[PDB]
């Protein structure tokens with residue numbers, strides 16, 4: 001009975017039909033720690049941050065939190081946010097090291113998603129599908145990396161202040177979004193970093209740019225996952241556009257978790273898809 005584990009950048013807390021545990025990251029100011037778990041009031045956190053004048057920070061999970069999440073299962077897949085932008089992958093590898101010294105029959109694969117959010121979700125769902133198909137651990141461990149090559153992520157961000165203050169995007173890139181009504185469109189790069197594609201004024205222009213990006217990426221109507229930070233309206237417009245243009249039936253629109261809400265910011269969208 002295999003176990004799936006992911007950091008909270010995956011935005012989800014359950015995978016119906018699977019054994020799954022999310023491991024919280026933490027967002028902090030000088031005054032308060034926000035743990036990205038079931039207790040988090042994200043709307044309140046965003047309100048605090050929008051009027052907070054000082055620096056804010058994020059932290060990866062402790063080794064103890066990973067160990068708790070592994071439980072005592074002998075076959076575990078762990079999906080992490082990109083090693084290109086976070087120490088999360090390393091923390092998971094450190095926890096795996098301890099776990100294997102404590103569980104002699106265990107197999108644990110840590111997967112650097114090279115991404116975040118909905119792309120981590122798509123990976124988790126594919127792991128689930130292969131497990132349900134009866135594939136063995138070693139088959140899944142090989143195959144998931146091949147599957148990941150046929151997935152992409154795009155985002156549209158209305159503010160990149162939190163990314164920029166934490167050194168995760170260049171100032172020049174972030175400055176575009178400082179203008180009211182301008183968003184920055186990005187993709188997950190081959191190095192697992194945020195690659196800015198361009199700027200965009202308004203929802204309709206974003207829909208057209210995304211359609212062009214999806215076409216070029218080899219999108220042909222496969223699985224599509226869209227998370228949003230208090231922008232269900234835009235996420236629903238994107239989903240409608242994609243259904244109409246590509247005939248997609250496997251679509252889910254859902255809310256971002258704490259970590260993705262912090263870095264994508266209010267208004268932000270992130271989407272991931274399977275490609276040919």
Ligand code: NA
Pocket residue numbers: 157158159176177178179180181182183
């Ligand atoms: Na903006």
